[PDB]
C-alpha cells in the first residue's frame, strides 16, 4: 500500500527536524496570523 | 434484452490493478479528467471572485 | 501516491489524521480571534475603533472553535482513529463517504473566512438572529456566506453521524453486544444520534433565514406575519443538543484516561456510565428554551424549562462520581494526560454548576446576556472540551505517531494552561453578576479591573499554545519510538503497535460466545 | 509506556532554537499588525 | 362617566408577557364601536373605554401605521 | 381498520397488481375526472395593496427583480397591481 | 487476504469532487443572489451531477460486478439509508414547525386570522386531492413491483416500476401546473413563504425519488437485480414511501387544515 | 450601577430583586459545597498508596448519588419557582410606560392621558459633565414615580434590543412586532442604570437606560413640562 | 399473470458475496460472520482459534454479561490462557483459500 510506521503515516515529512520546524511554523503560523490580517483588511477598506 | 452482467463481472474483476473508478476503460479516464478539471478550475475561479468581492468598488 | 493517500483516502486512520490536522489549524485561528476579543477589552476605550469588526471577530471565534476545532478534533480525529480499532473493525462502514465528510470542511471554512472578507463581515453573533441577520440590518453577501459555511459543515457532520452509527451498530465482533463496547464508542454513537436529529432542524432554520434574505419570504419578518422568535426556537432546538454534542465525546475520552491512569482494567459502574450518556442525550432535546427566558414566555412554560433543565444534573452527577470512584484505590500514574483529565473533572463541574444557577428563569432574567453566561460555557465547554482534547491527545499521540512526548514539557504545558484559563475566565463571574453584558466592545468604567485581569489571563494561555506547538515539534524531532505499552488487555486500540498498520483487523478478532 | 532513546536526540541548544522560532512565528505577524494599528484605523 | 382612568387594567384574556394581541384587540374594538355609532346615529363617547386602553397600550407607530392603512383601504383586520 | 375487501391469505405480487388496477388506478381516474371538471378559471379578485402580501425586501435575482419565479400575469398582481 | 466480510473501498477522487462541487454550488448561489452571475452555480451543479453519477456507478460496479456486497455490507447500507431518511424527516419537521407556529398565532399584520386577509387558498378537493391519490397509487404499484421482483417476474416488475415512475412524473407536472395557477406567491407573506418552501422541498424530493426509481428501472433492464439482492431498489422504495408520507402530512396540514 | 471591584449583584432596588439576592445566596452556597466536596474527594483518591484494583460493585452507591442530588435539586427548585410565580402575580399598575428599541437608542412613550414621548441617547464621552458616568449617561432620563406599580411595555422598530435594569432585576427583550410586558416598582428614589441586552449592531454597547425615580408630585410636573 | 427472467444469487452472485454464500451452504464460516461457541476451555479441551497466520487477537468475555473484554495476541504453539479467567485457547493455523 503506502509506507508504514513512525513518520510514514503522516502527509508531511519528519525526515529533517529543521525543515519540519519550518513547515510547522508556516502551518500553525499562518492560521494564527489570519484573524490579524482579516482585521487589518477590514480596517483598510474603511 | 439479454443478460450481460457476466461479461461486466469478468471485465471488472480483471486483474489489472486499476481502481474501480478507472476499471471500465478509457472513457472513465476522460470523465474523471473532465470532472476534476471543472472542480479545480471552478474552485480557482471562486478564489478569484472572493478576491474581487473582498474589496469595495465604491 | 501522495495524492492517492491524502486526497483520495478511504482509510479511517489517515482520515482521522487529516481531521486532527485541520482541527489544530482551526484552533490557532480560533485562538487568534479570542486574543483579539480580549485585546479590545484589555483596557477602557476602543482598540479597533470599529465595533462592527469586533462583532465579526466574536462571531468567527465561536463558529471556528465549535465547528472547526472541537467537532473536527473529537468526532473527526479521535472518532475515526479510535472507534474502528476499539471494536476490532477493519475500517468505517462507508470509508468513502467518510472522506467527503472531511473534505466538506475546508470549503465550509473557506466560506466562513470569505464572509468576513467581503462587505463588513457578519457581526451577528454565532446565533445569527434575524432581523440583525436580515438583508436590511446585515445587507450583502456576508451573512449569506456564513449560512452556507454552516450548510457544508452540517452535511459533513450529518453524514459523519450516519457513518458512526452504522459502524458501531453493525461492525462489532459477532459475539460483542453493545454493552461490551468501550465507553468512548458509546459516547461517539450517542453524539452521532444527536447530530443526526439536531442538525436538520438547524439546517431548516438557516434555510428559512436564507430565503427571508433572498427570496422575499417572511418567516421571521413580522411585516409578512413572520416571527423572529420562531428562528430562535429552531436554532436552539439544535443549539442545546449541540452543546452536549460538544462534550459527550470528551466524556468518553475522560472515562478512558481515568481508568487507564488509575491503573484500573475498567471504569467504575459501566452500565451507569451508559445510562448517564443516554439520559443526557435524551434530556438535551427537551430543554432548549432556557436560552430564551427573556424573550417573554408564559410563566408555566418558563417553569417547565427550569425543571427539565435541572434534571440533567442527576445523570451528570453519576458520571462525575464514577470517575472519582474509578480513581478510588487505583495505582495513580501522574501522567500529563491524567493531569488534564483531573483538571477537566474539576473545571467541568464548576461550569456545570453555574449552569444550574442559570437554569432558574428567575435568576436568569438578571444573568441572561451577561458575562456570567460567558463564564459558564467557557468553563464547561472551553475548559471542558479543550481539556479533554488535550488529555486524549497526549494519551494517544504515541499511538498515532509511534513517538513519545517529553512528559516534563507536557506537564509544564498543563500548568501554564491551568493558570491561564482560570485567570482568564473566573473574574467574568463577577463581571456578570454586577451586570456587564456580553457582546460589548467597551464597558462602563467600574468593570475595568476584572476586564484587565481576564485579558492578561488570555495571554498566558497563548504562551501555553505556542509551547504546545513546540512540544509537538520536539516529539517528531527527537524520534523516540514506542516499545511497550501497559494494560493493552483492556485497551484494544494499542494492540496493533505504534502506529498500527494501514489496514488493521484484516483478520478479525476471536471472541467466544460461550 | 517505554520507548527507545531518541533516534535523533534534540539537544538543549536545539530546543531553545526550536522554541524561540515557534514563539516568533506566533508573535511577529500579530505583533506587526497590532503595532501598525493606528496606521490602519485612519488611512 | 363611569371613568376616571389611570391606566389600562389587567385583562384576564391577556395575562402573559405578550400584550401584542391586547393592544390590537382594543384598537379593533374601538374602531368597530366607532363605526357602529357613527353609522346608526349614535354617540362615539361609548367607545371611549377601548380608546383609552388601546391608547395606553399600543405603541404610537403601530397606531399611526394602522390608521394610515385604514385610510388606504389596506387594513388587514376586519372592522 | 381492515378496509372492506379481504385477501390476506398471502400478500404477494398478484394481489398488489390486483390493487394497482382494481383500486389505486381507478382512484386516480375518478380524481382526474373530478379535477378536470371543477377546474375553469375563477374570477380574479380586486387588487388591494395589502402590506403583508407581495413582499419586496430585496429584488429577485431574475428578470427585472419584481416578478416572482412562477409569475402568472393573469392571477399574480405585482406590488402596484395586476399587469397589462 | 482479509477474513472478514466487510468492504475496503479503493482510493476514490469522488469525495473531493463532491466537496468542491458543494463549494461551487454554495459560492455560486452567493454569486447569483449578490453579484448577478450564474457561472459558478453552473459549474458547480455540473460537477455535482458528475460526482453523483460516477460515485454511484462505482457502487454498482463494486456490487453487481465485483461482488463486494456481502450480507454484512448490505446490512450496513440498510442502516445508513434508514438513518438518512430520518435526518430528512427532521429537516421537514423544521418547516412543519414554522408553518404551525405561524398559522396557530396569526399576527395582526395578517389581520390576526388564518388564512391571512387577502389569501385565497386552493380547493384541497381539487388538484391537491388528485396529487394525493397519485402518490398513494404509486405506493401500491411500487409494492406490486417489489413483489414481482422477489417472485422473479421481470416483465411485471418493469411494468409496475414503470407505472410508479409515470405517477411520480404526473404528480410533478400537476404540481408544476398548480405552482403557476396559484393566485399567491412566495413573496405573499408567511403563508406563501411556508406553502412554497414546504411543498417546494417536498417537490424536489419527488423529483429525486423519481430519478432514483428510474435508475432502478434501467439497472433492472440490464438485469442487475436478483430476486433476493436488490438494495438499490429497496432503498428507492423506502425513499418513495418517505416522500409519500411527507405528502400526507403536507396535504393534511397545509392544504386542508391550513385553509 | 456597579462600582469598582464589585463581586456580586448591584444592591436590590425593588422587593423582587431583594428576593433574588437571597435566592442566589441559597443557591450559591450549594454550588460552593458541591464544587469543594468534589475538589476535596479528588484530592482524597489521589493521596494514598493503598490500592484496590479489583471489580467494585455499583448498584448501591448509585442510590446515594442519585437520591441526594435529586433532593438538592428540589431544594433549589422550590424557592426558584415560588419567586417565579410571584413575579407573575396580578398587580394592577398605576401607570403604563412603553419603550422602543432603535439602532441605537431608546424612545419612551407615556400615553395613558397625554401623548408624551421622546428619544433617549447616550451622552458622548466628550460631552460628559464632570462626575458623569462614561457610557452610562443619557440625555433624557426615564422619569418615573418611586413606590408605585408601573407597567413597562417593550418592543423595537428595527432589530432586536433588550431593555435591562440590573438594580431592579429587569430585562425584557425588545422584539419588533411584539409587545413585552414587565412590571417595575422602586422602593427608593434616585438614578438607576442599565444597558441594551441583545446584540443590535455596531453600537449595541452604547445605548444605555437611565431611570429617574421621584415622588409622584414631581413626576406629574415633569410630565406636563415635557409635553 | 406470472413468468420469469430475474437472475438468482446462485446464478449471478460473484466475488466475496458468492464465496460467503457457498461456504454458508457447506456449513462453514471462513469470513468470521458467526460467533464461535466456546469449549470447556480446559487444558485438555482448549478453545480452538482458527487463523491464517501465526497469531490472532483473542477477546475473552470471562463471564457472561461482563462488560469488560480481555484482549491478547494468541500465538501459534502451546495453548495460552486468558490473563483474567485463565480459560485456554489454542491457535490452529492456515488455509481458507485453497
Ligand atoms: C482570579 C481573581 C480572584 C479575586 C478574589 C476575591 C477578592 C475579594 C476581596 C474582598 C471580599 C469581601 C467583601 C465583598 C463580599 C461580597 C459578597 C457577595 O455579594 O457575594 C457573591 C459574590 C462573591 O463571592 C465571594 O464572596 C467570592 C468567592 C470566591 C471563590 C473563589 C475560589 C477561588 C479559587 C482560586 C483563585 C481564583 C482562580 C481559580 C478558580 C478555579 C475555579 C474555582 O459572587 C460570586 O458568587 C462569585 C463566584 C461565582 C460562582 C463560582 C462557583 C464555584 C467557585 C469556586 C469553587 C471552589 C471550590 C474549592 C476551593 C478553590 C480551589 C482552587
Ligand atoms: C460543553 C458545552 C456545555 C454543557 C455540557 C453545558 C451544560 C449546561 N448548561 Fe450551559 N451553555 C453552553 C454550553 C454548555 N452548557 C453554552 C455554549 C451556552 C451559551 C450559548 C450562547 O448563548 O452563546 C450555554 C448556556 C446555558 C444556558 C442559558 C444562559 C443564558 O443565555 O441565559 C443555560 C440555561 O439554563 C445553561 C444551562 C446548562 C446546564 C444546567 C448544564 C448542565 O447539563 C450541567 C450539569 C452538570 C453539573 C450540575 C456539574 C456536575 C454535577 C454534579 C457534581 C452533581 C451534583 C449537582 C447538583 C445537585 C446541582 N447553559
Ligand atoms: C469550544 C468553544 C470555545 C473555545 C475553546 C473558546 C475559547 C476562548 N474564548 Fe470563547 N466563545 C465561544 C466559544 C469558545 N471560546 C462561544 C460560543 C462564544 C459566544 C460568541 C457569541 O457571543 O456569539 C464565545 C465568546 C467569547 C467571549 C465573549 C465575547 C463577548 O461577549 O463579547 C470571550 C471573551 O473573553 C471569549 C474568549 C475566549 C478565549 C480567551 C478563549 C480561549 O483562549 C480559551 C483558552 C483556549 C484555547 C487556547 C484553545 C486551544 C485549542 C487548540 C490550540 C486546539 C489544539 C488541537 C490539537 C492539539 C489537536 N469567548
Ligand atoms: C415544480 C415543483 C418542484 C420545486 C423545485 C423546482 C424549481 C425551482 C428551483 C429550485 C428549488 C429547490 C428547493 C426549494 C428552495 C426555495 C423554494 C422554491 C419552491 C418554488 O418553486 O416556489 C416558487 C418560488 O420560486 C422561487 O423563488 C424559486 C427560486 C429558485 C432559486 C432556488 C433558491 C435556492 C435556494 C436553495 C437553498 C439550498 C439550501 C438547502 C440545504 C439542504 C441542507 C443543507 C413558487 O413560485 P411563485 O411565483 O413565488 O408562486 C407561484 C405564483 N404563480
Ligand atoms: C409533524 C411532523 C411532519 C414531518 C413528517 C414527515 C414524515 C413522517 C415519518 C416516517 C415515514 C417514512 C418512511 C417509512 C418506510 C420504510 C423505512 C425503512 C424501514 C424498514 O423496512 O426496516 C427493516 C426492519 O426494521 C429495522 O431496521 C429496525 C432497526 C432500526 C435501526 C436504525 C435505528 C438506529 C438509530 C438510533 C437508535 C434509537 C434507540 C432507541 C432507544 C432510545 C430510548 C429513548 C430493514 O432492516 P435492517 O436495517 O437490516 O434491520 C434488522 C432488524 N429487523
Ligand atoms: C391526463 C391524465 C394522465 C393519466 C394518468 C398518468 C399515468 C398512469 C400510467 C399507466 C397505467 C395504465 C394501463 C396499464 C397498461 C397495460 C397493462 C398490460 C397487462 C394487462 O393487460 O394486464 C391485465 C389488467 O390491466 C388492465 O386492465 C389495465 C387497467 C386500467 C385501470 C384503470 C381504468 C378504470 C376503469 C373504470 C372503472 C371505475 C369504477 C370504480 C370501482 C370502485 C373501485 C374500488 C390483466 O391480464 P393477464 O392476462 O392476467 O396478464 C398477463 C401478463 N400481462
Ligand atoms: C446550499 C447547498 C448545499 C449543498 C451541499 C451538498 C453536499 C454534497 C453534494 C455532493 C454529494 C453527492 C455525492 C454522492 C454521495 C453518495 C454517498 C453514498 O451513497 O455513500 C454510501 C453510504 O451512505 C448510504 O448508503 C446512505 C446515505 C445516502 C447519502 C446520499 C448523499 C447526499 C448528500 C446530501 C445530504 C443532505 C442532508 C439531508 C438533510 C438536510 C456508500 O458509502 P461509500 O463509502 O461511498 O461506499 C461503501 C461501499 O461499500 C459501497 O459499495
Ligand atoms: C411529540 C411527542 C411528545 C409530546 C410532548 C408535547 C410537545 C410538543 C407537541 C405540541 C404542539 C401543539 C401545541 C399547540 C397548542 C398551543 C397553540 C399556540 O397558540 O401555540 C403557538 C405555537 O405552537 C407551535 O407552533 C408548536 C410547534 C411544534 C413545537 C414542538 C417541537 C418538537 C418537534 C420535534 C420532534 C420530532 C418528531 C418526529 C416526527 C415523526 C404560538 O405560541 P403562543 O405562546 O400561544 O403565542 C400567542 C400570544 O399572542 C399570547 O401569549
Ligand atoms: C434532475 C435530477 C437531479 C437531482 C439531484 C439528486 C439526483 C438523483 C438522486 C437519486 C439517487 C440515485 C442513487 C442511485 C444509487 C445507485 C447505486 C445503487 O443502487 O447501489 C446499490 C447499493 O445501494 C446504495 O448504495 C444506496 C445509495 C443511496 C442513494 C440515495 C440518496 C438520495 C440522494 C438525495 C440528495 C439530496 C438530499 C435532499 C436535499 C435537501 C448496489 O446494490 P444493489 O442494488 O443491491 O446491487 C447489487 C446486486 O446487483 C447484486 O446481485
Ligand atoms: C496577541 C498576540 C500578539 C502578542 C504581542 C506580540 C509580541 C511582540 C512581538 C513583536 O512584534 C513586533 O515588534 C515590533 C516592535 O518591538 C515591531 O516592529 C516595529 O517597530 C519598530 C521599532 O520601534 C521598527 O524598527 C520596524 O519598522 C517595526 O515595524 C513589529 O513590526 C512586530 O513584528
Ligand atoms: C423488452 C422487455 C421484455 C424483457 C426483456 O428485456 O427481454 C419489455 C417487457 C416489459 C417492459 C414494458 C412494460 O410492459 C411497461 C411499458 C409499456 C409500454 O407502453 C411502453 C414501454 C414499457 C416501459 C416497457 C418497455 C419494454 O421494453 C419492457 C422492458
Ligand atoms: C415552546 C414550544 C412552542 C414553540 C413555538 O412557539 O413555536 C411549546 C409548544 C408546546 C408547549 C408545551 C405544551 O403546551 C405542554 C406543556 C404545558 C405547560 O404549561 C408548560 C410546559 C409544556 C411542556 C409546554 C412547553 C412549551 O410551551 C411548548 C413546548
Ligand atoms: C437496569 C440497568 C442495566 C443493568 C444491567 O443490565 O447491567 C441499570 C443501569 C444503570 C442503572 C441506573 C443508574 O444506576 C442510576 C439510578 C440509580 C438508582 O439506585 C436506581 C435507579 C437508577 C436510574 C438505575 C436503574 C437501573 O438499575 C439501571 C438503569
Ligand atoms: Cu440595542 Cu444592543
Ligand atoms: Cu442549552
Ligand atoms: Mg439575549
Ligand atoms: Na474596548
Ligand atoms: Zn486497501
Ligand atoms: Zn426486497
Ligand atoms: Zn477470560
SS3 G226: strand
Q: Which of H166, G94, H16, H23 is nearest to C306 (CA)?
A: H23
Cβ atoms of C173 and C511 within 8 Å: the answer is yes
Ligand nearest to C-alpha G44: 7
Give C61 to chain B, closest Cα distance, Å: 20
Kindly identify which residue of chain I lies nearest to residue B3, measuring between CA atoms: I7
For residue A38, give every residue at least 6 positions away whose Cβ sits within 8 Å of its Cβ, in sequence order, or none. Answer: C113, C116, C117
Cβ atoms of C62 and C68 within 8 Å: the answer is no
State the cell numbers at C343. 483538571
Edge to edge, the sheet with strand I70-75 lists C510-511, I55-60, I70-75
CATH number of I1-98: 2.60.11.10
Give C486 to chain F, closest Cα distance, Å: 59
Contacting partners of chain D (3+ CB pairs under 8 A)? A, C
Cβ atoms of C448 and C44 within 8 Å: the answer is yes
Span from the CA of H88 to the centroid of ligand 12 (angstroms): 18
**The CATH number of the domain where A29 resides is what?**
4.10.49.10
Judged by CB atoms closer than 8 Å, whether chains meet at H42 and C265 is answered as no
- The residues with which C296 forms a beta bridge, in sequence order, are none
Q: Work out how many CB contacts closer than 8 A connect E with F.
A: 10
Q: Which runs of E-coded beta strand occur in C14-77?
A: none
Domain boundaries, given as residue ranges, for chain I: 1-98
Alpha-carbon span A13 to D8, nearest angstrom? 15
The total number of structural domains in chain A stands at 1
**The CATH number of the domain where H51 resides is what?**
1.10.287.90
Cβ atoms of E26 and E50 within 8 Å: the answer is yes
With a 6 Å cutoff on the Cβ, whether C296 touches ligand 12 is no
What's the domain range around H55?
2-91
Interior CA angle at H216 toward H213 and H221, to 5°?
100
Backbone angles phi, psi at G228, to 5 degrees: -125, -5
- Read off the DSSP letter of residue H166: G
Same domain, H115 and H164: yes
State the cell numbers at F42. 375563477
Cβ atoms of F82 and F51 within 8 Å: the answer is no
With a 6 Å cutoff on the Cβ, whether G9 touches ligand 7 is yes
Edge to edge, the sheet with strand H150-156 lists H116-120, H105-110, H95-102, H150-156, H180-184
Alpha-carbon span C405 to I23, nearest angstrom? 48
- The residues with which H192 forms a beta bridge, in sequence order, are H211
End position of a domain, from candidates H65, H91, H117: H91
Cβ neighbour number for residue H171 with a 10 Å cutoff: 26
SS3 C186: helix
E vs H contact (3+ beta-carbon pairs below 8 A): yes
C495-499 long-range CB contacts below 8 Å, 24 or more apart?
A: C495/I57, C495/I71, C495/I73, C496/C85, C497/C402, C498/A6, C498/C398, C498/C399, C498/C401, C498/C402, C499/A5, C499/A6, C499/A9, C499/C13, C499/C399, C499/C400, C499/C401, C499/C402
What's the domain range around A27?
1-46
**Pairing status of strand H161-165 against strand H105-110:** unpaired
State the cell numbers at G113. 386570522
With a 6 Å cutoff on the Cβ, whether C203 touches ligand 4 is yes
State the cell numbers at H12. 436590590
Cβ atoms of G148 and G160 within 8 Å: the answer is yes
Give A23 to chain C, closest Cα distance, Å: 10
- The residues with which H105 forms a beta bridge, in sequence order, are H102
The total number of structural domains in chain B stands at 1
**The CATH number of the domain where B55 resides is what?**
4.10.91.10
CA G163 to chain centre: 18
Alpha-carbon span C22 to C400, nearest angstrom? 16
Residue with cell 413573496: G187
Interface of A with B (CB under 8 A): 41, 45-46
Span from the CA of G159 to the centroid of ligand 11 (angstroms): 7
From chain A, the residues in CB contact with B56 under 8 A are: 45-46
The torsion region of residue G189 among left (phi > 0), alpha (psi -120 to 50) and beta comes to left
Q: Which runs of E-coded beta strand occur in C406-497?
A: 482-484
CATH number of E1-79: 1.10.10.140
> Is the Cβ of D16 closer than 8 Å to some Cβ of chain C?
no
Atom of ligand 1 nearest to the CA of C346: 42
Span from the CA of C159 to the centroid of ligand 7 (angstroms): 7
Residue I85, annotated as binding a ligand:
yes
Q: How far is CA C271 from CA C292, C312, G136, H62, I65, in A?
A: 34, 17, 45, 11, 11
Amino acid at each position: 500500500h503506502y509506507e508504514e510506521g513512525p513518520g510514514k503515516n503522516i502527509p508531511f515529512s519528519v525526515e529533517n527536524k529543521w525543515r519540519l520546524l519550518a513547515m510547522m511554523t508556516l502551518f500553525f503560523g499562518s492560521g494564527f496570523a489570519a484573524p490579524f490580517f482579516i482585521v487589518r483588511h477590514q480596517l483598510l477598506k474603511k | 434484452f439479454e443478460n450481460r452482467v457476466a461479461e461486466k463481472q469478468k471485465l471488472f474483476q480483471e486483474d489489472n490493478g486499476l481502481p474501480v473508478h478507472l476499471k471500465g476503460g478509457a472513457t472513465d479516464n476522460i470523465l474523471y479528467r473532465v470532472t476534476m478539471t471543472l472542480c479545480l478550475g471552478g474552485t480557482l475561479y471562486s478564489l478569484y471572485c472572493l478576491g474581487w468581492a473582498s474589496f469595495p468598488h465604491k | 501516491m501522495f495524492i492517492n493517500r491524502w486526497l483520495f483516502s478511504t482509510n479511517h486512520k489517515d482520515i482521522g489524521t487529516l481531521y486532527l490536522l485541520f482541527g489544530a489549524w482551526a484552533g490557532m485561528v480560533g485562538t487568534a480571534l479570542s486574543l483579539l476579543i480580549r485585546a479590545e477589552l484589555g483596557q477602557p476605550g476602543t482598540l479597533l475603533g470599529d465595533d462592527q469588526i469586533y462583532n465579526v471577530v466574536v462571531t468567527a471565534h465561536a463558529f471556528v472553535m465549535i465547528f472547526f476545532m472541537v467537532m473536527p478534533i473529537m468526532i473527526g480525529g479521535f472518532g475515526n482513529w479510535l472507534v474502528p480499532l476499539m471494536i476490532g473493525a477493519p475500517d468505517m462502514a462507508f470509508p468513502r463517504m467518510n472522506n467527503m465528510s472531511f473534505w466538506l470542511l475546508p470549503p465550509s471554512f473557506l466560506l466562513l473566512l470569505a464572509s468576513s472578507m467581503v462587505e463588513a463581515g457578519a457581526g451577528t453573533g454565532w446565533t445569527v438572529y434575524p432581523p440583525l441577520a436580515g438583508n436590511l440590518a446585515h445587507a450583502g453577501a456576508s451573512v449569506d456566506l456564513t449560512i452556507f459555511s454552516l450548510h457544508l459543515a452540517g452535511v459533513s457532520s450529518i453524514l459523519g453521524a450516519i457513518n458512526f452509527i452504522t459502524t458501531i451498530i453493525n461492525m462489532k465482533p459477532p459475539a460483542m453486544s453493545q454493552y461490551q463496547t468501550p465507553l468512548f464508542v458509546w459516547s461517539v454513537m450517542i453524539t452521532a444520534v444527536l447530530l443526526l436529529l439536531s442538525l436538520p432542524v438547524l439546517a431548516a432554520g438557516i434555510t428559512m433565514l436564507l430565503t427571508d434574505r433572498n427570496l422575499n419570504t417572511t418567516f421571521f419578518d413580522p411585516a409578512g406575519g413572520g416571527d423572529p422568535i420562531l428562528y430562535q426556537h429552531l436554532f436552539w432546538f439544535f443549539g442545546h443538543p449541540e452543546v452536549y454534542i460538544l462534550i459527550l465525546p470528551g466524556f468518553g475520552m475522560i472515562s478512558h484516561i481515568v481508568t487507564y491512569y488509575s491503573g484500573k482494567k475498567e471504569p467504575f459502574g459501566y452500565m451507569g456510565m451508559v445510562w448517564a450518556m443516554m439520559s443526557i442525550g435524551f434530556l438535551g432535546f427537551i430543554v432548549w428554551a432556557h436560552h430564551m427566558f427573556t424573550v417573554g414566555m408564559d410563566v408555566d412554560t418558563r417553569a417547565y424549562f427550569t425543571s427539565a433543565t435541572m434534571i440533567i444534573a442527576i445523570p451528570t452527577g453519576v458520571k462525575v462520581f464514577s470517575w472519582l470512584a474509578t480513581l478510588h484505590g487505583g495505582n495513580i500514574k501522574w501522567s500529563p494526560a491524567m493531569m488534564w483529565a483531573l483538571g477537566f473533572i474539576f473545571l467541568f463541574t464548576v461550569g456545570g454548576l453555574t449552569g444550574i444557577v442559570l437554569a432558574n428563569s428567575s435568576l436568569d432574567i438578571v444573568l441572561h446576556d451577561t458575562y456570567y453566561v460567558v463564564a459558564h460555557f467557557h468553563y464547561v465547554l472551553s475548559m471542558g472540551a479543550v481539556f479533554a482534547i488535550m488529555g486524549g491527545f497526549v494519551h494517544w499521540f504515541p499511538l498515532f505517531s509511534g513517538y513519545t512526548l517529553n512528559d516534563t514539557w507536557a506537564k509544564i504545558h498543563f500548568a501554564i494552561m491551568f493558570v491561564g484559563v482560570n485567570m482568564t475566565f473566573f473574574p467574568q463571574h463577577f463581571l456578570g453578576l454586577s451586570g456587564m453584558p456580553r457582546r460589548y466592545s467597551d464597558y462602563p468604567d467600574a468593570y475595568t479591573m476584572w476586564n484587565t485581569i481576564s485579558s492578561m489571563g488570555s495571554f498566558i494561555s497563548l504562551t501555553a499554545v505556542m509551547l504546545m506547538v513546540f512540544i509537538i515539534w520536539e516529539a517528531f524531532a527527537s524520534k523516540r519510538e514506542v516499545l511497550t505499552v501497559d494494560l493493552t488487555t483492556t485497551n484494544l486500540e494499542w494492540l496493533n503497535g505504534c502506529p498500527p498498520p494501514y489496514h488493521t483487523f484484516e483478520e478479525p478478532t476471536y471472541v467466544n460466545l460461550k | 509506556i517505554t520507548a527507545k532513546p531518541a533516534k535523533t536526540p534534540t539537544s538543549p541548544k536545539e530546543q531553545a532554537i526550536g522554541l524561540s522560532v515557534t514563539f516568533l512565528s506566533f508573535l511577529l505577524p500579530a505583533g506587526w499588525v497590532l503595532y501598525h494599528l493606528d496606521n490602519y484605523k485612519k488611512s | 362617566k363611569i371613568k376616571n382612568y389611570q391606566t389600562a387594567p389587567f385583562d384576564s384574556r391577556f395575562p402573559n408577557q405578550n400584550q401584542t394581541r391586547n393592544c390590537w384587540q382594543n384598537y379593533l374594538d374601538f374602531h368597530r364601536c366607532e363605526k357602529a355609532m357613527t353609522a346608526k346615529g349614535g354617540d362615539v363617547s361609548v367607545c371611549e373605554w377601548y380608546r383609552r386602553v388601546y391608547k395606553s397600550l399600543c405603541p404610537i407607530s403601530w397606531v399611526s401605521t394602522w390608521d394610515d392603512r385604514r385610510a388606504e383601504g389596506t387594513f388587514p383586520g376586519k372592522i | 381498520a381492515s378496509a372492506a375487501k379481504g385477501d390476506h391469505g398471502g400478500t404477494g405480487a398478484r394481489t398488489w397488481r390486483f390493487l394497482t388496477f382494481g383500486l389505486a388506478l381507478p382512484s386516480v381516474a375518478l380524481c382526474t375526472l373530478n379535477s378536470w371538471l371543477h377546474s375553469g378559471h375563477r374570477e380574479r379578485p380586486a387588487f388591494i395593496p395589502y402590506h403583508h402580501l407581495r413582499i419586496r425586501t430585496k429584488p429577485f435575482s431574475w428578470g427585472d427583480g419584481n416578478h416572482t419565479f412562477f409569475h402568472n400575469p393573469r392571477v399574480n398582481p405585482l406590488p402596484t397591481g395586476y399587469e397589462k | 487476504h482479509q477474513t472478514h466480510a466487510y468492504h475496503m473501498v479503493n482510493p476514490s477522487p469522488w469525495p473531493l469532487t463532491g466537496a468542491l462541487s458543494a463549494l461551487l454550488m454554495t459560492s455560486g448561489l452567493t454569486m447569483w443572489f449578490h453579484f448577478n452571475s450564474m457561472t459558478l452555480l453552473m459549474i458547480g451543479l455540473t460537477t455535482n451531477m458528475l460526482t453523483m453519477y460516477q460515485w454511484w456507478r462505482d457502487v454498482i460496479r463494486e456490487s453487481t460486478f465485483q461482488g463486494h456486497h456481502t450480507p454484512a455490507v448490505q446490512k450496513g447500507l440498510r442502516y445508513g439509508m434508514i438513518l438518512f431518511i430520518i435526518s430528512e424527516v427532521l429537516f421537514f419537521t423544521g418547516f412543519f414547525w414554522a408553518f404551525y407556529h405561524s398559522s396557530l398565532a396569526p399576527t395582526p399584520e395578517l389581520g390576526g386570522c388564518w388564512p391571512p386577509t387577502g389569501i385565497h387558498p386552493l380547493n384541497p378537493l381539487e388538484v391537491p386531492l388528485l396529487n394525493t391519490s397519485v402518490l398513494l397509487a404509486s405506493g401500491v404499484s411500487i409494492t406490486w413491483a417489489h413483489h414481482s421482483l422477489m417472485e422473479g417476474d421481470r416483465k411485471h416488475m418493469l411494468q409496475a416500476l414503470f407505472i410508479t415512475i409515470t405517477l411520480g412524473v404526473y404528480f410533478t407536472l400537476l404540481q408544476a401546473s398548480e405552482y403557476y395557477e396559484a393566485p399567491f406567491t412566495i413573496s405573499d407573506g408567511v403563508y406563501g413563504s411556508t406553502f412554497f418552501v414546504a411543498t417546494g422541498f417536498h417537490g424536489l424530493h419527488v423529483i429525486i425519488g423519481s430519478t432514483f426509481l428510474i435508475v432502478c428501472f434501467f439497472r433492472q433492464l440490464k438485469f442487475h437485480f436478483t430476486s433476493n439482492h436488490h438494495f438499490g431498489f429497496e432503498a428507492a422504495a423506502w425513499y418513495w414511501h418517505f416522500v409519500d408520507v411527507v405528502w400526507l402530512f403536507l396535504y393534511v396540514s397545509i392544504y386542508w387544515w391550513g385553509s | 450601577m456597579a462600582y469598582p471591584m464589585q463581586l456580586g449583584f448591584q444592591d436590590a432596588t425593588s422587593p423582587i430583586m431583594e428576593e433574588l439576592l437571597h435566592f442566589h445566596d441559597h443557591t450559591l452556597m450549594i454550588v460552593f459545597l458541591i464544587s469543594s466536596l468534589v475538589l476535596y474527594i479528588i484530592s482524597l483518591m489521589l493521596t494514598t498508596k493503598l490500592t484496590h484494583t479489583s471489580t467494585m460493585d455499583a448498584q448501591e452507591v448509585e442510590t446515594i448519588w442519585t437520591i441526594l442530588p435529586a433532593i438538592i435539586l428540589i431544594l433549589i427548585a422550590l424557592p426558584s419557582l415560588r419567586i417565579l410565580y410571584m413575579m407573575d402575580e396580578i398587580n394592577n399598575p398605576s401607570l403604563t410606560v412603553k419603550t422602543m428599541g432603535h439602532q441605537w437608542y431608546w424612545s419612551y412613550e407615556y400615553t395613558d392621558y397625554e401623548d408624551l414621548s421622546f428619544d433617549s441617547y447616550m451622552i458622548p464621552t466628550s460631552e460628559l459633565k464632570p462626575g458623569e458616568l462614561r457610557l452610562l449617561e443619557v440625555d433624557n432620563r426615564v422619569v418615573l414615580p418611586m413606590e408605585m406599580t408601573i407597567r413597562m411595555l417593550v418592543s423595537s422598530e428595527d432589530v432586536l434590543h433588550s431593555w435591562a435594569v440590573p438594580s431592579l432585576g429587569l430585562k425584557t427583550d425588545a422584539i419588533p412586532g411584539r409587545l413585552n410586558q414587565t412590571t417595575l416598582m422602586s422602593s427608593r428614589p434616585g438614578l438607576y442604570y442599565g444597558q441594551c441586552s441583545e446584540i443590535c449592531g455596531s453600537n449595541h454597547s452604547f445605548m444605555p437606560i437611565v431611570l429617574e425615580l421621584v415622588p409622584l408630585k414631581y413626576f406629574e410636573k415633569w410630565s406636563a413640562s415635557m409635553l | 399473470a406470472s413468468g420469469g427472467g430475474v437472475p438468482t444469487d446462485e446464478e449471478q452472485a460473484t466475488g466475496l458475496e458468492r464465496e460467503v454464500m457457498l461456504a454458508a451452504r457447506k456449513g462453514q464460516d471462513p469470513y468470521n460472520i458467526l460467533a464461535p461457541k466456546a469449549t470447556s476451555g480446559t487444558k485438555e479441551d482448549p478453545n480452538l482459534v482458527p487463523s491464517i497466520t501465526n497469531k490472532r487477537i483473542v477477546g475473552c468475555i470471562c463471564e457472561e454479561d461482563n462488560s469488560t473484554v480481555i484482549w491478547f495476541w494468541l500465538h501459534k504453539g502451546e495453548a495460552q490462557r486468558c490473563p483474567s479467567c485463565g480459560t485456554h485457547y489454542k491457535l490452529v493455523p492456515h488455509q481458507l483459500a485453497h
